[PDB]
Amino acid sequence: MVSAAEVVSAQENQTYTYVRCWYRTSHSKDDAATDWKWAKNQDGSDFTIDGYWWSSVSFKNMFYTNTSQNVIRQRCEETLDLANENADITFFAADNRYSYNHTIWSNDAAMQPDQINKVVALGDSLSDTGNIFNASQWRFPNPNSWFLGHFSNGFVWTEYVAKAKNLPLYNWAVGGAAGENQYIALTGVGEQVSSYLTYTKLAKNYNPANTLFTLEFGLNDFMNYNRSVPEVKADYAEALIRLTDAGAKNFMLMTLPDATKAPQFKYSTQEEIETIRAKVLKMNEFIKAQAMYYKAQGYNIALFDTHALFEKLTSAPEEHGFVNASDPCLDINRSSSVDYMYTHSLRSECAASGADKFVFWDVTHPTTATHRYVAEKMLESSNNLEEFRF
Numbered sequence: 001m002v003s004a005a006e007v008v009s010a011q012e013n014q015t016y017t018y019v020r021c022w023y024r025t026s027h028s029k030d031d032a033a034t035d036w037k038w039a040k041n042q043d044g045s046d047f048t049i050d051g052y053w054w055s056s057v058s059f060k061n062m063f064y065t066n067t068s069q070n071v072i073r074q075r076c077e078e079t080l081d082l083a084n085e086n087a088d089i090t091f092f093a094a095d096n097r098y099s100y101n102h103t104i105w106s107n108d109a110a111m112q113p114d115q116i117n118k119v120v121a122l123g124d125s126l127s128d129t130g131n132i133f134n135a136s137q138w139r140f141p142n143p144n145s146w147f148l149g150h151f152s153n154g155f156v157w158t159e160y161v162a163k164a165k166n167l168p169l170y171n172w173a174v175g176g177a178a179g180e181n182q183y184i185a186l187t188g189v190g191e192q193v194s195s196y197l198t199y200t201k202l203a204k205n206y207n208p209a210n211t212l213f214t215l216e217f218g219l220n221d222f223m224n225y226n227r228s229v230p231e232v233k234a235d236y237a238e239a240l241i242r243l244t245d246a247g248a249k250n251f252m253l254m255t256l257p258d259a260t261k262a263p264q265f266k267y268s269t270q271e272e273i274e275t276i277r278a279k280v281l282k283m284n285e286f287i288k289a290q291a292m293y294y295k296a297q298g299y300n301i302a303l304f305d306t307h308a309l310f311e312k313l314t315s316a317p318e319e320h321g322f323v324n325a326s327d328p329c330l331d332i333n334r335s336s337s338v339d340y341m342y343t344h345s346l347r348s349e350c351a352a353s354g355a356d357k358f359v360f361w362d363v364t365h366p367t368t369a370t371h372r373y374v375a376e377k378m379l380e381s382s383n384n385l386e387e388f389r390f
């Protein structure tokens, strides 16, 4: 994807950069608003990281450093000095106030034990941690009502999984239900796989066998692009073929929840609902066949039935720690992509119960309590990832 000559030239172009530490301003997960501060050292001087920059034709610049994610995290926690359990700290590389949020890749050591040491996420808005946020010039999704480019009031399921295992998370996921395709073109799983393959050729001592891959895709295609079941099946199979041929060995796979149970479908016709629900059911049977196909070949596959979990969550939310599974927490009573540009109050029922008792944050996307509940159910069912080496 990148020539040997291009790789050394980029890696030898050594420099330094600063770290932007982001945090939730409120102690409540009902308030999505965030702010940032520059990372500092305990003596009060600016915290810098050494390394090199690289971007493909896409021009999403990634900073590659030898400094670990744990060290950078610790610097942010110490700089911010918040006694907020909901601070939900995230960090990025940035030369100054004009710079956007660049992901920092912590390069592995040549001496690497045979165990997972990072999570790589592919998919849609159910996994996106901010890939549309820089392109939108930090205006979409509106950072007062959506948590720093996450289509939720906080962390998504991949972030809870990565945190539970104390691993860094590198995100290639990006959705379409919110009109994301008006800000970045190349959002298909195929383009995400190509991007991942391109950026990891610039990483040092990269062993794909030590990556835990998460993949969830198909709802964007069925809901927003009216794609046929065979073409989504073919893309899903192609992503796994491409990844396994590129040394991937560890996967967290999942069935698609019935998206028609989301609040936005209150405004859809029954014919539209029945078409989407039926496509989800055939895709789920193919996802199970694919998980079994790779499992039979000796790959480490964890398959979670999110569909069956979601059916239980919506039929009896009271049994799963929720009061409402039908309505958004935000006071959004239509399905209009322009609503992602504005600040919204919480509807009375959600203001009263708190966002952690609502399944949905907006008309499409689940709350961070739902994301954590899924992440915890995934970790339990796979016995804190029993077939994976940590």
Ligand SMILES: CC/C=C\C/C=C\C/C=C\C/C=C\C/C=C\C/C=C\CCC(=O)O
Binding pocket: 124, 125, 126, 127, 157, 174, 175, 176, 177, 178, 216, 217, 219, 220, 223, 224, 254, 255, 256, 257, 258, 259, 260, 262, 306, 310, 364, 365, 366, 370, 371, 374
């Ligand atoms: C594939 C699901 C696996 C993990 C994601 C974690 C939690 C999801 C939990 C419950 C289901 C919630 C909502 C279903 C409704 C809509 C999905 C939303 C967006 C997908 C399409 C897009 O981003 O364009």
